[PDB]
Each structure stands twice: as C-alpha cells, then as structure tokens.
Subunit: 146 residues, 3 copies
C-alpha cells in the first residue's frame, strides 16, 4: 500500500539521519537504537563491526579518538525496495572535520551504501558500508568556533 510504503520510507530516512547525528553529536543512545543485533557496519580499511555494541566499539575506539570533532552532511538518500521487508539505500555524505594527527582540517566526500530489514513490523539497519572518494587535507584552513 502507498501508505505503508511512505511510512516505511520515513522510518528509514530517520534511521539514516540518526546514524549521522549519533556519530557527530557522540550520542550513544541514538546511535545504538538504529541497528539489529546482527547488523554489520563495514568501513573500508578498518573492518566489520556488528550490532549496536559493535557500532559503539568502532566509534569509541577507532573513529572518535582520531578526531577533535567533525560534522557529516547527508544528501541524496535514495531508497529501493528489494522486497516488502528489505530496502537498499545509497547516500552522498560531505564530512568536515578536525583531525588530531597533524592538527589538520579534512574534507571527506563519501558514499554510504545501506540495507534495512523489517522484523515484526519494525525497521532497523541490517548493513552499512562507507567508502571515501575524497579524503582531502585543507592546507592553510582550520575549522574553528566563533
């Protein structure tokens, strides 16, 4: 039904934004809430982490210690139904951040490839794959507060 399809798309759009906001604002509750326990988050070059606790392990131990702070701007999220209970997503993400190593500011252009599964009526992430197309140090530029 059109209504179910639209409600599903809204739920999935919220899951995806919750991933970005949870990682950026370092909100462990929001970030943990969006994953099935067997969901897999793979970062090219780092490895595969599983479920809510795997997601928190990745950001607390690998990602967050590498950065003073960053912001991820998600755009162009496009969803396709593989089946009534499985959705593919693709999204384009622009990340700006302050790297600890070398005190460098960095611009990252990434593509996020995602999968969502509905189980007993509820949608959550089943897969996330992040690939960086640009990883660009910004000579002479440092992102600073007012």
């Amino acid at each position: 039904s059109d209504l179910d399809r639209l409600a599903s798309r809204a739920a999935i759009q919220d899951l995806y934004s919750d991933q970005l906001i949870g990682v950026d604002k370092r909100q462990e509750g929001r970030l943990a809430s969006i994953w099935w326990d067997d969901a897999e988050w793979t970062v090219e070059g780092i490895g595969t982490y599983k479920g809510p606790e795997g997601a928190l392990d990745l950001v607390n131990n690998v990602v967050w210690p590498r950065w003073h702070d960053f912001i991820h701007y998600g755009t162009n999220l496009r969803l396709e139904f593989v089946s009534a209970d499985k959705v593919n997503g693709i999204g384009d993400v622009l990340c700006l951040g302050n790297l600890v190593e070398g005190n460098q500011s960095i611009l990252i252009a990434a593509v996020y490839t995602s999968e969502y599964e509905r189980r007993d009526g509820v949608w959550k992430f089943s897969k996330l794959n992040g690939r960086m197309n640009y990883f660009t140090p910004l000579a002479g530029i440092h992102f600073v507060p007012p």
Copy 2:
C-alpha cells in the same frame, strides 16, 4: 494516524526549507509566512526576535547588511513529536558566504534547533535557535560568479 503524521512531517519540512530559502534569496513573503506571531527566533550573541516582523527586522538590520550574499545548505532534519501538536526539530546547516567586513569568504557549520506548533489545524514555527560550531574565514578563497 500514519497519514496525519506524514502530512505533518511534510508541512514542517517545507517550513524549515522556507526559512533557509527566504533568508538566502531575500524573499520577504516566504520568510514571513512560516512564523506564528509569538514565535521566537534567537541567535546566540544577537538576541531574540519575535514573529514574522521580528524575523524581517533581524535579517534586514543585522544579518543582510553584513553580507554581500550567502547560501545555506540544510541537511539531516530530524523531527520528534513532543505531543500531537508540538514538534521538535534538529538540523545541520552548512553556510558559504561573502562577508562585507574585510571582503572575506566564510564557511559556517551550524546547528538549528526548532519547534513547531499546530494551531487550528495549521503548522508554523514557534521557535528557532541557531548555534555556530564553525565560523571559518577561508584564506585565499573568494566565492565568485562564473
């Protein structure tokens, strides 16, 4: 109902984009249309402005004279229903602009924290709070037309 919830989210997503477009394109009609008369727009460091006329006072007298032009890219707008007639929003905004003072180009990363109220069936802004996390002059870079 799911239908009402989805219609409300669409109306609120339009209000929020109308704020950004109205300020960027300097469209006073669009910008005035989105506020209850008792809505409060607070900018950290500038103060609180009230309603459609307060919004126009802020941009005509404080913001627009400071800039030759700018563009605000809104992403990650995430809505939560506090009640059936009150919604909280959070959004991440990337702003690029040409400041009059010093002829500087600036990159701003901001978080917009918003509230919307439904009154007699209609949604409008009741609150907007803007906070800048990055305010970054861009040495050697000036945003210019083709």
Copy 3:
C-alpha cells in the same frame, strides 16, 4: 487527497535525486529514466537539450569530458503544485569537482529550477534549468582519494 499528494512528492523527490546521482555516478540508465521525451534541460551558456537522449548527449559530449570527476550535494528541495499534474521545484546544489583544464579543483554553488508533469498517472521531469551562482577555483586545494 493527502495520500496522493504525499506519494507524488516522494516520486518527484526520487526523480530529482536520480538526476544528481545519474550525472555523478555516470549511470546512463538511471539518468535516462527520469525524463519525458519532450522534456527540456537548459544549462545557461550551453543551450537546451531534449529528452532522455538529449540529457545523455549533454553529459557525454559537453559535461563529462570537462571533468575527471565531481559530486553534487542536493539540499532544500521545495515543491509546489501548479496544478494537480504539474509541479515546480527549486533546489540548492553544492558541487565539488576536479576540472580537466588546468587540473583545478572547483566549488560550485548552483540553483536548480525544475518542472514535473504527471501523464497517465506517472511523474517525470518536464524541465530543468541550472544556474551557477558561485564557480570558484580553489587555489592550493586538490580533491584526492585516500
């Protein structure tokens, strides 16, 4: 009906993201799928191209040869119904890219002005107009992969 309006908005939001993704990922199938045969895509300074084959002519012969690669981030897409079967869109697009000429990296801020028509129940593009407000070479910065 609210349901039809929401379903139409979702279809049109997908058309618009498909334009950006198709041009960026150089996916000819996705890019061709979104146009009526009499749709017109005008780029200020280049000309007017018609339909799916015109769209592919423009990107294969004029745009793609000029760039090693680029990415378009679409935000603030705002839709208005001119009639039940005709929709106006406006959108703000941030483009980052690597130009062949001079090996320059470029930041583009553009406004996309679009029209969509429903024919026998189906939505597709009838018009796209792209205008660049910023076309900014980035001295000392080159977008590179990890």
